[PDB]
Design a protein around this ligand. Sequence first.
Ligand SMILES: OC[C@H]1O[C@@H](O[C@H]2[C@H](O[C@@H]3[C@@H](O)[C@H](O)[C@@H](CO)O[C@H]3O)O[C@H](CO)[C@@H](O)[C@@H]2O)[C@H](O)[C@@H](O)[C@@H]1O
Ligand SMILES: OC[C@H]1O[C@@H](O)[C@H](O)[C@@H](O)[C@@H]1O
Ligand SMILES: [K+]
Length: 418
Amino acid sequence: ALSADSIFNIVEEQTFQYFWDGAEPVSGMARERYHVDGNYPENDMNVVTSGGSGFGVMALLVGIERGYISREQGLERLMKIVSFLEKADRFHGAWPHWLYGETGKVKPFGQKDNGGDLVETSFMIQGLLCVRQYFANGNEQEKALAARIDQLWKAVEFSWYRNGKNVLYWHWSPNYKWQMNFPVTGYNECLIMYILAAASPTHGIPAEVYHEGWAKSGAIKDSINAYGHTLKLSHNFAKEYGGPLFWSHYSYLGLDPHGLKDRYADYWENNLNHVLINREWCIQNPKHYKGYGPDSWGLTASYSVKGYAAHAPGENNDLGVISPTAALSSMPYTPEYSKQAMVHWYNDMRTKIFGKYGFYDAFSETENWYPQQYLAIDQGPIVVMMENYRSGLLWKLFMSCPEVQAGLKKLDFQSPYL
Ligand SMILES: OC[C@H]1O[C@@H](O[C@H]2[C@H](O[C@@H]3[C@@H](O)[C@H](O)[C@@H](CO)O[C@H]3O)O[C@H](CO)[C@@H](O)[C@@H]2O)[C@H](O)[C@@H](O)[C@@H]1O
Ligand SMILES: OC[C@H]1O[C@@H](O)[C@H](O)[C@@H](O)[C@@H]1O
Ligand SMILES: [K+]
């Protein structure tokens, strides 16, 4: 029976290994998935994911900082990644969701999603900007990396994805054009795309794209009340309890939500309340699933008993599946509650739910379902948020970008970093 502190470092280190020992070997990029038993129904073990690899380059910086790898080891790996990303398919400067690791060519995420994915590109840029800042004051080779990252950053054509409108579209294809037809309106996980779009010095957006598009001219404001907690953001399709918990993770890995506010919300309090509602649902456990309680909580999108599902509170959304990234990546918001789950899982369940790349993606005690499987997009925010809770690493780096601060000012945000 180990201490939280011992467990914390074991979990952080092993989770980081998804992105190191687990990386696709040619590219260095994060695999979409890793299945311990070697069985890949889609034969896609070496398909890498642009968004999750953004998480992973952050994780590499955690690795250098915690001594998991040397500074030099980290640098050479990031160099390899950036080389790959310089030759990979880009679609008005945005990477696709999926790439073949060995070649850097697109794998369509469904037939018509065969071009750019601006949302996944934004998670890659959040992470690559942290790397730019980390190296900006090092040696000749570190600065040339920082510059090549700056170049990739500046070539993302955020404005292209407006398609002439006051909003950003998620996708664009060479041949299918705008047929995916997903204009990105809030609230969902995608805030960082609009912030980066405003920040871009070469291909930015005017403020109306954010206010009329993301914010729906104010219709993003809501009042979702559960367990005595209020969300003031209109969580898309989740007006009872808020969405899957990762919405309070992905856009907040670099962007620091502490003290972040604008006319639509106080992001700290809304992110926190999102977590506390999620946890409370698991404590009340209305569907009477096995294992739900204060030592085992957190619903988010992940592998599921019948495949993959966007788990969340509500009788229609909670499938008896707990996914560790929900509670663990919530460490900066709810450290003691996130540690409570982490400790129970490690001390009492590790032989079922803990593996070489940290805790597995999802489990159901109701169904005795304990797949030895992992997803980049679930492991990455665990490593990153655990380190943010510890030291602020990625927040410090990201928030230091002059362009991030300008973009936040342009969109009428408040934050101490400004
Ligand atoms: O396939 C498009 C895009 O979907 C992203 O999911 C969004 C989800 O989008 C769903 C869409 O996928 C679904 O087919 C239709 C009808 O069922 O409705 C939309 O809501 O919406 C939520 C709420 O805004 C987002 O959190 C979620 O991420 C995938 O993430 C993305 O990878 C994919 O390209
Ligand atoms: O990217 C995360 C997951 O999204 C799901 O919709 C897809 O079916 C999976 O291939 C993928 O692992
Ligand atoms: K197979």
